[PDB]
Amino acid sequence: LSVNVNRSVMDQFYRYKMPRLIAKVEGKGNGIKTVIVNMVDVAKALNRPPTYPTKYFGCELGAQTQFDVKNDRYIVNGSHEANKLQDMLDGFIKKFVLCPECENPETDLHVNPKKQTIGNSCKACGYRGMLDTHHKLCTFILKNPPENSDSGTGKK
């Protein structure tokens, strides 16, 4: 490796982007807190800031959260690396992705606004059924009902 770090840049930047989660460790709070400077950028670029669900994640690291309004910077007690945040958040998705029939092949999930429920289909055995199992991340996502009708296939 005889070039620049390119840690903050490297993609060709032409049309496709990948908002990865970046975590930074600081020496403040009880002696070590995690500060996410990309949580608002990634959340704002795809939706709102997960300041509400920030408490659940803190419960896992034994730490809670911290918010700055005059600063717009939010920190979570405890120091963790970006790769670590994916492991815990990944366990949440594991609750439904690993279905008792398609816990391997990539499956899709379709939520119907008429029945107010999430469907789950796997392209490996036809599974295609319901997505929920129990009070799990399925409800958080179910809060975003899609939009469809009886005709007009095409618009995105």
Side-chain angles (χ1 to χ4, degrees):
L1 173 121
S2 234
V3 302
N4 273 31
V5 179
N6 290 8
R7 242 207 211 252
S8 20
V9 295
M10 45 122 114
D11 172 28
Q12 225 223 248
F13 267 99
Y14 49 102
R15 203 79 175 91
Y16 156 102
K17 312 230 212 176
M18 205 226 164
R20 56 109 68 208
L21 215 91
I22 289 156
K24 280 185 86 76
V25 180
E26 262 181 298
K28 257 86 215 276
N30 190 257
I32 249 285
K33 59 170 205 189
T34 266
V35 45
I36 317 190
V37 304
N38 205 25
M39 168 186 262
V40 168
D41 249 289
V42 310
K44 196 275 123 117
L46 74 95
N47 222 271
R48 247 220 296 245
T51 7
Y52 230 134
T54 294
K55 234 299 308 217
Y56 240 49
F57 312 150
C59 220
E60 201 118 27
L61 41 130
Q64 292 140 126
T65 79
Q66 175 82 246
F67 279 122
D68 223 325
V69 309
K70 258 301 254 271
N71 225 233
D72 316 304
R73 241 77 89 198
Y74 320 148
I75 320 295
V76 163
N77 289 289
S79 57
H80 338 90
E81 154 149 74
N83 305 41
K84 274 233 79 144
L85 307 196
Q86 268 196 302
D87 206 50
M88 34 169 280
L89 223 180
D90 167 55
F92 236 118
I93 282 132
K94 280 214 138 158
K95 288 271 91 113
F96 77 102
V97 291
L98 294 346
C99 236
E101 229 134 70
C102 51
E103 166 251 340
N104 255 121
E106 174 75 49
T107 78
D108 261 304
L109 45 148
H110 66 88
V111 191
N112 314 272
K114 252 306 229 185
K115 184 120 153 77
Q116 191 231 246
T117 40
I118 306 187
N120 176 234
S121 187
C122 164
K123 64 164 51 66
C125 205
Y127 178 102
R128 203 148 153 203
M130 245 199 77
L131 201 192
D132 234 21
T133 326
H134 235 272
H135 300 354
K136 264 301 111 111
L137 74 170
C138 306
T139 302
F140 274 30
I141 57 182
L142 165 63
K143 81 92 133 156
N144 283 286
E147 235 274 34
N148 266 287
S149 202
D150 216 326
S151 181
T153 63
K155 49 128 69 187
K156 239 243 215 312

